[PDB]
């Protein structure tokens with residue numbers, strides 16, 4: 001008669017990094033607050049922690065360079081041993097067409113003999129509503145931005161082992 | 164004793180386009196509302212006019228793909244005959260360090276025999292305050308984004324003469 005409906009759209013992308021899983025993970029997750037702006041100087045102005053110690057439940061905030069505003073990451077899972085990290089974004093995420101309830105970003109870095117690692121990236125869009133309409137360019141935009149942050153960090157660390 | 168101080172920082176960049184000045188201009192300025200999203204499908208979600216007919220005093224608004232918000236362009240000069248266009252952004256423009264009063268974006272497309280044209284891009288940052296501190300990466304970010312919108316449009320039109 002009157003159902004509750006929700007869509008979960010999952011995009012998955014992978015690539016092989018030359019950098020070891022441990023180093024890429026520590027770069028993004030533990031040293032993000034100082035390395036995101038270094039890696040993405042023309043996009044990330046500032047990366048800071050608003051609440052928490054870095055563990056699950058931490059809230060971080062990225063301010064972007066120029067008139068692109070800013071956004072909070074709500075950290076969900078942090079697993080140093082398996083180089084796995086998950087966080088959600090809750091605000092500023094609607095499409096002109098399709099409201100979303102949240103976007104979940106997840107990566108898992110898996111060592112490959114030789115180092116570095118296979119970077120397994122996932123994004124999940126959660127839709128509110130009776131209805132669903134999501135285009136290829138949007139879905140791809142989210143996962144490409146995400147894998148892009150990770151690539152920029154990897155590249156920065158390769159060029160500055162020191163730090 | 165107590166002066167009024169203001170800085171105007173101007174960045175200038177140029178490149179040669181294969182596309183003619185007339186076509187690139189008409190693309191960005193006259194057909195922007197439909198071509199910006201086509202040219203930049205992973206960044207510009209929507210480009211619309213909020214007030215005005217397209218002339219000086221028009222207010223347009225770009226909504227960006229993802230959690231990057233949206234921004235209004237206030238159109239200052241429109242010169243089809245000389246393929247020249249100027250607009251200002253007034254909001255969301257501070258650096259963590261340095262408030263700005265506005266950013267002015269200006270281009271002039273000058274035909275080169277052969278077509279297309281030399282794309283002359285300018286950005287001007289106007290600072291409020293007693294004090295001034297602006298880094299290379301920020302300044303470059305603004306002009307690179309700008310010349311980047313123009314390159315994306317040129318590339319789109321080259322690949323789709325039809326339209």
Ligand SMILES: c1coc(CNc2ncnc3nc[nH]c23)c1
Pocket residue numbers: 062071072073089103105138141142143145146149228229230
């Ligand atoms: C939806 C479409 O494109 C995006 C990119 N935003 C984004 N990507 C990856 N990590 C993020 N952290 C905050 N916002 C983020 C979200």
Ligand SMILES: c1coc(CNc2ncnc3nc[nH]c23)c1
Pocket residue numbers: 065066067225234235236252266268301304305306308309312
């Ligand atoms: C300041 C630093 O980077 C920017 C890029 N924002 C921007 N560029 C070009 N045209 C625009 N129209 C609105 N926002 C625009 C502004």
Ligand code: NA
Pocket residue numbers: 045063064065066067068069255256257258
């Ligand atoms: Na900003």
Ligand code: NA
Pocket residue numbers: 092093094095208226227228229230231232
């Ligand atoms: Na958006």
